[PDB]
Amino acid sequence: MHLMYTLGPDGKRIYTLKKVTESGEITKSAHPARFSPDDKYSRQRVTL
Amino acid sequence: DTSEWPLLLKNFDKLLVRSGHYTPIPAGSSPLKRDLKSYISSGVINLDKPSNPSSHEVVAWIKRILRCEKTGHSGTLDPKVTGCLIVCIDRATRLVKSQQGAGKEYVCIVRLHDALKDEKDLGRSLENLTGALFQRPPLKRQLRVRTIYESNLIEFDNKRNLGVFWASCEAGTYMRTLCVHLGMLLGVGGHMQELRRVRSGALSENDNMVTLHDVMDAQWVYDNTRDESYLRSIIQPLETLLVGYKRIVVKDSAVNAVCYGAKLMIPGLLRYEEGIELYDEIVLITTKGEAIAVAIAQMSTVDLASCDHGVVASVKRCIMERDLYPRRWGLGPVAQKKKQMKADGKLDKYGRVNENT
Amino acid sequence: PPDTVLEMGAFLHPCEGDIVCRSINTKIPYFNAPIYLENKTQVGKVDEILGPLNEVFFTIKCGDGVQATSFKEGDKFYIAADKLLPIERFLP
Amino acid sequence: GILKTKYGFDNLYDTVISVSTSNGNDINELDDPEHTDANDRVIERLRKENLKFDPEYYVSEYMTHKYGNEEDLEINGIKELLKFTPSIVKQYLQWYKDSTNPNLVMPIEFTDEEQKQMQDNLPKKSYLVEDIKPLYVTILSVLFSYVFEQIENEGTHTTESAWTMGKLCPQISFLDQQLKQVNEDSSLIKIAIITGIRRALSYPLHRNYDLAMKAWTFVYYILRGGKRLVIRALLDIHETFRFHDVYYVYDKVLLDDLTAWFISQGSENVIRSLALEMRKEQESLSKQDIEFECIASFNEEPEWETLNIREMEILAESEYREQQQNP
């Protein structure tokens, strides 16, 4: 996947293709992680 | 001060009053103060669909996880989109038709098949394809007219041959066609590289968008510790999808008629919003702030203030169940009283209640 | 053999083996509607129709042994007048 | 076991309904539309009508009509509803007044819009139907639905019009054309009429014996108007279903055919005969025939007590005195 973002000052996503912006912020994938219906890690992920 | 109240109850005193006399029927609950089974049953999850299993498979997963009679959802046009999928649960399915014809916004990455001799050309061809467009469905496929209200090129990289832009459009508009069309308008050819949906109707990726992982956890947490707070945060009440609409609150006594599709009449009117124009789409609400139905207004606010008789609203779409507010005279179980008439005589020779006085 | 013919498209540019045209008719082509030069020879058929309501464009899928790159700006393209729908048949 | 049990017009259709339940068909009330014979459909309906009927709702509606004030009555609607005359009835009544022989059939010229409907929206075909008697009774049933819908809504259709009509109609919500059980008294037309009433006291917004009776009287009038006036109503019914993106399905399996069939094979003598037949049956009825099994509990499972609708009004009016007296 190519779509990346950083949160602007207003709190909302700013989209970009670059892996790091012009101002030196490292960018996040725009898309959520895959989900596997059988995921017994619900208990580990919930405590944090 | 009432501008702190949740959802459809925000700014309740900023509604112009009609009647002072009425009595509150004990039935029903307010949307936020609903109870789990029926809260979920008027439920709506703003889901961040992952880029993969089809919208229908994903909704199926939500169904298997939550276990509920029905689930539907806001839109499917492209199968590899990530982003807003509004999954409706049970009674909320009543609102998917509207959610599907609702305006949608996208962030799209286009792949041009060769480098443009003028980079500025893309922004221009993108600007070219706004308003009423012609568009034929990709891969039963008839030519139709869809509108692109606004678009905006965010970023373009001619060497990589990828452009990323935003489009706001009518429901039914295909982004993968949009991409092919820029392709043709620029000569180099093109196609959609990837797509993310950033708003579906009244819900954007900013308004409490949760993931499949959240849905699994929220459900796990109840099934094991019986705490609801999670489950009750990822699920927003259908009344959410209706904040935009102007409001008419309906007398408790008149609520049930609306649930059967009947007009709302003046006798049934309790409060109304300012600046309601004849023919607008309004929401009709209980005093607890429940959405009874979405309706077409039939009287201007000025008419609604001065009018003695008349019909106020026709029902466009029933949301609320049919006998949620039945108008019980509060006598006492009729059948049960006939059991005590066997238990004490007073019943006639044939076994039927006596017309006596 | 063709009969009565109308001005349909004016050559804009090629695109991966297809002819893209600016529209010069007020009507809208049928899908696969055969396309002709002035000398009434079938150069291919209508493929994609696109563009805004005011500024329609369409593509021509080139017929056997017809190069997309063997044309220039101005070069007009034609259609059978029976293979055209008014714009009214798509509006509300 | 294997084969589906066909349903709808002349029992020609299957699958259609089953599929429609996944698509939001909440008119269907059969638990298993594809695997339920005609007799079992009755059993199932009769039992479901009992669970659906609400006596507390029934008494509330009665007491309001008889004893509620100017305010409560205007919220409810019942008094206005009972004064109302549907457009179709009204043009029969108008013909009746002017006519010096009230016994003839009523001449109808179908409107331009109605001519268009009959060309476009209905199947063009011959109909070999040997067993036409359940088709007429379906007409009898569906007209009651329609007339009820017109009254309750005061002439203007609404987004639940098809639902109201489909509910009051046993051939639609239960795909039931037999109506009468067979196992191992009363006419079939008499049952159709009782069924109409019982459903009209369990399902719609206004649950009122007088209303149900008024609707039936109006059915008799349309029938007396003759085939061509029946067709006019059938056309309206048809449209209300066709125009619905979920319930259109009942045109498919039943009303599509029924209206097309009726237009060509429909007899004028059979219509008039049905009219006089149903009037006799209606006039032979009273609140005493309208019985519902209602619930009282038991712990030593729920125990059903049988009571007709008149018994329910006396217990209401009896207990209403104690409330008026004590305080």
Domain interval for residue A8: 1-30
B110: three-class secondary structure by DSSP: strand
SS3 content of chain C, % helix, strand, coil (to 5): 5, 50, 45
Of B307, B108, B293, B291, give the one whose Cα is nearest residue B198: B108
Contact B154 A16 (CB under 8 A): yes
What is the C-alpha to C-alpha distance for residues C24 and D111, in angstroms, rounded to an integer?
44
Q: Are B161 and A2 in contact (CB under 8 A)?
A: no
Distance, in Å, from the CA atom of B83 to the CA atom of D97, rounded to the nearest integer, reads 67
Alpha-carbon span C76 to B66, nearest angstrom:
61
Q: Kindly state the tokens that stand for C51.
A: 């563009």
For B137-268, where are the E strands, in sequence order? 144-157, 162-169, 190-200, 203-204, 236-237, 246-250, 264-265
Q: Which of D56, D64, D74 sits opposite B334 (nearest CB)?
A: D56
Handedness of CA B178, B184, B185, B189 (dihedral sign): positive
H or E element in which residue B254 lies: none
Q: What is the DSSP letter of D253?
A: I
Q: Where are the beta strands (DSSP E) in chain D?
A: 291-296, 303-308
Q: What's the token pair of residue B231? A: 């489950």
Contact B55, B85 (CB under 8 A): yes
Residue with tokens 């209206």: D259
How large is the angle between the packed helices B334-342 and D55-67, nearest 10 degrees? 100
B157 contact A CB<8A: yes
Tell me whether B212 touches chain A (CB under 8 Å): yes
DSSP letters, D107-143, are P----HHHHHHHHHSS-------S--HHHHHHHHHHH
Q: What are phi and psi of B98, to 5 degrees?
A: -65, -50
**Nearest of B132, C33, B187, C18 to residue C8 by alpha carbon:** C33
Does an interface of 3+ CB pairs under 8 Å exist between C and D?
Answer: no
Let me know: does B197 contact B76? Beta carbons within 8 Å: no
Which residues touch D149 (CB under 8 Å, ≥6 apart)? D157, D161, D164, D165, D168
- What is the token pair recorded at D125? 């075909």
Looking at residue B79, its amino acid is P
To test the contact with chain B by mutation, choose from D64, D75, D286, D288 the residue with the greatest count of B C-beta atoms within 10 A, namely: D75
Query: How far B331 CA lies from chain D's nearest CA (Å)?
Result: 7
Kindly compute the dihedral angle of the four CA atoms of residues D171, D175, D177, D183, in this order, to the nearest 10 degrees.
-130
The C-alpha atoms of residue B42 and residue B44 are separated, in whole angstroms, by 7
Taking the C-alpha atoms of residue B161 and residue C61, their distance in angstroms, rounded to an integer, is 25
Q: Which of B164, B167, B153 is nearest to B198 (CA)?
A: B167
- Chain B nearest CA to D199, separation (Å): 15
Method: X-ray
Q: Quick one: DSSP state of residue C79?
A: E
Q: For chain D, first and last CA: distance in Å?
A: 63
DSSP secondary structure letter of residue C41 = -
Mutation choice for A interface testing from B199, B216, B229 by most A CBs within 10 A: B216
Per-position b or e across D29-56, b if 16+ CB within 10 A of its CB: bbeebbebebebbbebbbebbbeebbbb
**Residue D59 with chain B: CB contacts under 8 Å:** 329, 331, 334
- Rounded CA separation D273/B234 (Å): 63
In this structure, is the dihedral angle defined by the CA atoms of residues B74, B76, B78 and B81, taken in order, positive or negative? positive
Q: What's the CATH number where A5 sits? A: 4.10.80.300
Chain B residue at shortest CA distance from A12:
B206
Q: Are B217 and A46 in contact (CB under 8 A)?
A: yes
Q: Rounded to an integer, what distance in angstroms lies between the CA atom of residue B293 and that of residue B247? A: 11
Bridge partners of residue B168, in order along the sequence = B105, B150
Q: What's the N-to-C CA distance of chain C in angstroms?
A: 37
**CA atoms within a 13 Å half-sphere pointing along the CA-CB vector of D123:** 16
In angstroms, the separation between the Cα of residue B259 and the nearest Cα of chain C is 31
Cβ-contact B346, B354 below 8 angstroms: yes
Three-state DSSP state, B45? strand
- Cα–Cα distances in Å, from A20 out to A6, A24, B166, B193? 9, 6, 20, 20
Q: Which two tokens stand for residue A32?
A: 């959520």
Which fold, B1-241?
Pseudouridine synthase (3.30.2350)
Nearest-Cα distance to chain B for A47, in Å, is: 10
Tell me the sheet residues that pair with B200.
B104, B203
From CA B343, how far away is CA B330, in angstroms rounded?
A: 23
For residues D273 and D255, give the distance between their C-alpha atoms in angstroms, rounded to a whole number: 22
Which H helix or E strand runs over B14? none
CA atoms within 13 A on the CB side of B254: 27
Would the CA dihedral through D73, D75, D80, D85 be positive or negative? negative
What gap in Å lies between CA C31 and CA C61, rounded to an integer?
11
What is the token pair recorded at B349?
A: 């020779």
- Residue B131, Ramachandran bin (φ over 0: left; ψ between -120 and 50: alpha; else beta): left
DSSP state of B148: E
Q: Do B184 and C50 touch (CB under 8 A)?
A: yes
Q: Which residues of B touch C (CB under 8 A)?
A: 113, 128-136, 143-145, 180-181, 183-185, 187-189
Q: In the 8-state DSSP scheme, what is residue A34?
A: P
Backbone angles phi, psi at B214, to 5 degrees: -70, -45
- Token pair of B305 as six digits: 């203030």
User: How many whole angstroms separate alpha carbon D151 and alpha carbon D86?
Assistant: 6
Instruction: Kindly indicate whether the domain formed by C1-92 is annotated with CATH number 2.40.10.230.
Output: yes
The alpha-helical segments, DSSP class H, found in chain A are 42-47
Q: Backbone phi, then psi, for B264, in 5-degree steps?
A: -100, 130
Tell me which chain B residues have a C-beta less than 8 angstroms from the C-beta of C18.
184
Q: Is B78 in the active site? A: yes
B236-237 and B43-49 strand pairing: antiparallel
Active-site position among B1, B35, B48, B78: B78
Dist. CA B182–CA B185, nearest whole Å: 5
Cα–Cα distances in angstroms (integers) from residue B235 to residues B40, B161, B240, in the given order: 7, 40, 10
Domain limits of chain B?
Answer: 1-241, 242-357
Reduce the DSSP state of residue D210 to 3 states and report it.
helix
- Name chain A contacts of B109, Cβ cutoff 8 Å: 2-3, 17
Minimal CA–CA distance to D227: which of D274, D275, D273, D267?
D267
Q: Which residues contact D235 (CB under 8 A, 6 or more apart)?
A: D114, D117, D118, D259
Q: DSSP letter string over B253-305?
A: GGHHHHTTTPPEEGGGEEEE-SSPPTT-EEEEE-TT--EEEEEEE-S-HHHHH
Those of residues 4-43 in A touching chain B at CB distance below 8 A are 11-13, 15-17, 30-35, 37, 39, 42-43
